[PDB]
Amino acid sequence: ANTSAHDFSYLKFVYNATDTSSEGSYDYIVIGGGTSGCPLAATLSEKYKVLLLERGTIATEYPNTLTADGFAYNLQQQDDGKTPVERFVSEDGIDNVRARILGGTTIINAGVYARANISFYSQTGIEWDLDLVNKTYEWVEDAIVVKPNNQSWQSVIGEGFLEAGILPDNGFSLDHEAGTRLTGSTFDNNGTRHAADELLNKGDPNNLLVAVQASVEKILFSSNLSAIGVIYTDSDGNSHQAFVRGNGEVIVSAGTIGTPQLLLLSGVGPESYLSSLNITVVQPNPYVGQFVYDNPRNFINILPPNPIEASVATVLGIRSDYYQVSLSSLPFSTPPFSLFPTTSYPLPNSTFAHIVSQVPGPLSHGSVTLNSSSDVRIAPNIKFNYYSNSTDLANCVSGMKKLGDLLRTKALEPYKARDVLGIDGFNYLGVPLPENQTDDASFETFCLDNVASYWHYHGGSLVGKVLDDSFRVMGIKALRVVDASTFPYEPNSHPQGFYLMLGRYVGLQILQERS
Ligand SMILES: Cc1cc2nc3c(=O)[nH]c(=O)nc-3n(C[C@H](O)[C@H](O)[C@H](O)COP(=O)(O)OP(=O)(O)OC[C@H]3O[C@@H](n4cnc5c(N)ncnc54)[C@H](O)[C@@H]3O)c2cc1C
Ligand SMILES: *[C@@H]1O[C@H](CO)[C@@H](O[C@@H]2O[C@H](CO)[C@@H](O)[C@H](O)[C@H]2NC(C)=O)[C@H](O)[C@H]1NC(C)=O
Ligand SMILES: *[C@@H]1O[C@H](CO)[C@@H](O)[C@H](O)[C@H]1NC(C)=O
Ligand SMILES: *[C@@H]1O[C@H](CO)[C@@H](O)[C@H](O)[C@H]1NC(C)=O
Ligand SMILES: *[C@@H]1O[C@H](CO)[C@@H](O)[C@H](O)[C@H]1NC(C)=O
Ligand SMILES: *[C@@H]1O[C@H](CO)[C@@H](O)[C@H](O)[C@H]1NC(C)=O
Ligand SMILES: *[C@H]1O[C@H](CO)[C@@H](O)[C@H](O)[C@H]1NC(C)=O
Missing domain, CATH: 3.50.50.60 (FAD/NAD(P)-binding domain)
Structure with a gap:
């Protein structure tokens, strides 16, 4: 088109x-x-x-x-x-x-x-x-x-995915393949x-x-x-x-x-x-x-210190065990129903980026x-x-760990509120990735408690x-x-x-x- x-x-x-x-x-x-x-x-x-x-x-x-x-x-x-x-x-x-x-x-x-x-x-x-x-x-x-035009937020997550190891770079492609790519959209360029x-x-x-x-x-x-x-x-x-x-x-x-x-x-x-x-x-x-x-959705929300432009998802990070994408949005006083799993969820006061992982299958x-x-x-x-199947849960853990790597990239660094070394320099809306906690059980608890559709x-x-x-x-x-x-x-x-x-x-x- x-x-x-x-x-x-x-x-x-x-x-x-x-x-x-x-x-x-x-x-x-x-x-x-x-x-x-x-x-x-x-x-x-x-x-x-x-x-x-x-x-x-x-x-x-x-x-x-x-x-x-x-x-x-x-x-x-x-x-x-x-x-x-x-x-x-x-x-x-x-x-x-x-x-x-x-x-x-x-x-x-x-x-x-x-x-x-x-x-x-x-x-x-x-x-x-x-x-x-x-x-x-x-x-x-x-x-x-259509082949979508460039959007700055999508281009950042595009560079982040490559850096975090979601290889290779597939360029623009409509095919579901392992690695990072710009894919198609049914939103046109207007x-x-x-x-x-x-x-x-x-x-x-x-x-x-x-x-x-x-x-x-x-x-x-x-x-x-x-x-x-x-x-x-x-x-x-x-x-x-x-x-x-x-x-x-x-x-x-x-x-x-x-x-x-x-x-x-x-x-x-x-x-x-x-x-x-x-x-x-x-x-x-x-x-x-x-x-x-x-398929479960698990996500984090970052609130950048400077405003980010709103974008539609076009750029994908595919692995066999997790499919990742991101959207950036304007703030709202009314929640879009089911973006977050319940109605009792904090409201963003500024632009945020919704950063998401999908479990394949699921089982x-x-x-x-x-x-x-x-x-x-x-x-x-x-x-x-x-998450009644344990293979689903393990796959979520893997995806969440990849999101940590994404947030550690140089590509994502300018969107940190504080210039410290760790990912706690980001401001979050809702639950951060388990802070400091390295072992699998912290991720499992994060996966089960914060799952969306x-x-x-x-x-x-x-x-x-x-x-x-x-x-x-x-x-x-x-x-x-x-x-x-x-x-x-x-x-x-x-x-x-x-x-x-x-x-x-x-x-x-x-x-x-x-x-
Ligand atoms: C918020 C949201 C975002 C998504 N984002 C994407 C995306 O970005 N990319 C992507 O590939 N997929 C996305 N998906 C998933 C994808 O859109 C769906 O899996 C797919 O559209 C479903 O197609 P379908 O033909 O099964 O159902 P539908 O397209 O829903 O077809 C069902 C039709 O049947 C009608 N119907 C139901 N009961 C009756 C009845 N008794 N009599 C007459 N009519 C009836 C319904 O009103 C509906 O119009 C998204 C889905 C949602 C809900
Ligand atoms: C570009 O986008 C605008 C919306 O920003 C489109 O305007 C709509 O199109 C039809 C005219 O064909 C109207 O009936 C709607 O009322 C318009 N909507 C709005 C929100 O203004 C426009 O058509 C697009 N242009 C092209 C060439 O596709
Ligand atoms: C869009 O894609 C890349 C950067 O993501 C670059 O090669 C090219 O200059 C961009 N095109 C336009 C028209 O900005
Ligand atoms: C169908 O299309 C894919 C690209 O999407 C291609 O690699 C494959 O060879 C095609 N199969 C046939 C039978 O043409
Ligand atoms: C494609 O499908 C096969 C068979 O279901 C699966 O094992 C493989 O991981 C899939 N590839 C990707 C990149 O999702
Ligand atoms: C129909 O839905 C409500 C919740 O929406 C539920 O509590 C009730 O048991 C359901 N009725 C039947 C017959 O299953
Ligand atoms: C789900 O995973 C496999 C594949 O279907 C199945 O055989 C098994 O019963 C389930 N696993 C668990 C932990 O229930």
């Missing part, structure tokens, strides 16, 4: 769910207009009639989702039930967010773009067409990814956010209908079981149904949280569990909503369960079980547990699942790139079958 305005041309075929027919018929129904849903929708409409169903509204309604500068704003904004950010708390007690908007989490994220680690393909076991994977990345990148919603512009406007403020509450089934259609409600509280045509399919792309939720409500999940809630079992499947993962996991057994608009229960949560409808190699729900015809719920491990440090590619890639697979 180059600099241009967010392209809203697709609005010519976006309708409020209140204005759709009571009973619809399409070749394809895509539930959830997010990261995978949008390009899958657009792709299938090249040839067939597609209905895309999104519970949120359109991003024009929320202007702060449209700029690089607006990132904190949407997180700070209070959740009223219609806003683009939906707040929740895991049962672990860590604050967290998901999207509720057309374009999905790409409309609210930090804009970091990367391709999957090339070892990911062989690790899964799926026979990926790697040529086509690449062409599909190229298609996303041409539409919404501050404008580009997102999955713009990929709708690649669709055929006479094949694709997008319905917004559509809350999909049930998948509909025949009595050789098949998905036949969906029930959705509109903003007026009225019910609508939509059915698939011969050889067409329902695709669930409701995300890590919404997919298991929808499947469970539709009677696809653990049998004795669904029976305890008086839901009719259509397909017993023990793994619907199991193996849900959230720890929990579940998504129903809270309401009938209402999709009531959030499900989610538990991540942060990295927001890259995945799983709950896994390939191999619920899905086959082609993303079909096992035992059920004409049903697929395509979003972040499909994999038990991260494809790289920043997964939007992979899930954008996956929306289209699965679409092309489907279109090849129809040939």
